Structure 1
Amino acid sequence: GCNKALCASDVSKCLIQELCQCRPGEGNCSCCKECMLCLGALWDECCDCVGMCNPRNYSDTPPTSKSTVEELHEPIPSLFRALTEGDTQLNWNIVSFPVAEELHMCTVVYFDDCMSIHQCKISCESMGASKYRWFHNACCECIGPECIDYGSKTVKCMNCMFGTKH
């Protein structure tokens, strides 16, 4: 957790001054601002040592955790509805879920085969979608005109689940 070699010198220096005596983890941390200033440049690599921040290296960042979202210029909502409602394309997985779940209803299209971001924007753009979300596992999710936000965080698109549990 704590990087002892980098932090042992400076981290102890604050402790002698008696800073960083307050745990943010439960309750208010009055000293938190003072503790950060005493650490200075080492706060990023040493806030764990004083308990002010989560341990540095414990989780292996799944690729799905990142997604990149852009809003398409000049959306064409009528097209998006027309291609969604009817017998959908096999390449397309269509999910409608209640709007504001991610935080009437929000409908998104999940492309099957994994694709590059630039293709994903183009494919959504050809669909008239208001927005697209690109998971860093490379799953592509077009966002319908109705949807308030960026749609579901779930990597629900078939034939590219790499980056998900089991």
Structure 2
Amino acid sequence: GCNKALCASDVSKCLIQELCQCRPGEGNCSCCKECMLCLGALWDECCDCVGMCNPRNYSDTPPTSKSTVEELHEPIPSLFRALTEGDTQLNWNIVSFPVAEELHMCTVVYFDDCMSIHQCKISCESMGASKYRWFHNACCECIGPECIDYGSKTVKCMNCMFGT
């Protein structure tokens, strides 16, 4: 967790001054701003040592955790409904879930085969979608006009579950 070699000198220096005596983890941390100032430039790499921030990661972050989201110019909602309601295309997986679940109903389309982001935007754009979310596992999720937000964080598209 704590990087002793980098941080031992400066971190101890604050401790002698008696800063960073308050734990954020339970209750208010009155001293937190003061502790950060004493650390200064080393706060990002040493806040773990004083307990003010989480330890340097014990875990490998899934690629799916990142996603990149853009809102399409000039959405065409009528087109989006027409291709979804009817016998849906096999390459497309269609999910409707209640709107604001991710935080009437929100409908999204999950492309099957994994695709590049630039391809994903074009495919959503041809669909009339208001927005698209691109998972960094490369799963692509077009966002319907109804949906308030960016839609489900889940990588629900078949044939690209990589990262699970």
The TM-score range, normalised by the shorter chain, is over 0.9
Q: Which residue of 2 aligns with 1:17?
A: 17
Write out per-residue CA displacement over residues 65-86 of structure 1, whole angstroms, 9 at most, x where no aligned residue: 0000000000000000000000
* CA RMSD of superposed structures (Å): 0.4
Q: Structure 2 CA distance, aligned partners of 1:99 and 1:130?
A: 15
Q: Helix, strand or coil for the counterpart of 2:82?
A: helix
Tell me by how many angstroms 1:57 deviates: 2.3
In structure 2, the gaps of 5 or more residues are none
Give the alignment's TM-score, normalised by structure 2. 0.99
Q: Helix, strand or coil for the counterpart of 1:16?
A: helix
In structure 1, the gaps of 5 or more residues are none
Q: What's the % identity of the aligned pairs?
A: 100
Give the alignment's TM-score, normalised by structure 1. 0.98
Write out per-residue CA displacement over residues 124-157 of structure 1, whole angstroms, 9 at most, x where no aligned residue: 0000000000000000000000000000000000
Off by >2 Å, runs of 4+ in structure 1: none
Write out per-residue CA displacement over residues 84-121 of structure 1, whole angstroms, 9 at most, x where no aligned residue: 00000000000000000000000000000000000000
Tell me by how many angstroms 1:161 deviates: 0.2
Q: Helix, strand or coil for the counterpart of 1:68?
A: strand
Q: Structure 2 CA distance, aligned partners of 1:58 and 1:77?
A: 44
Q: Structure 2 CA distance, aligned partners of 1:44 and 1:37?
A: 12
Q: Helix, strand or coil for the counterpart of 1:59?
A: coil
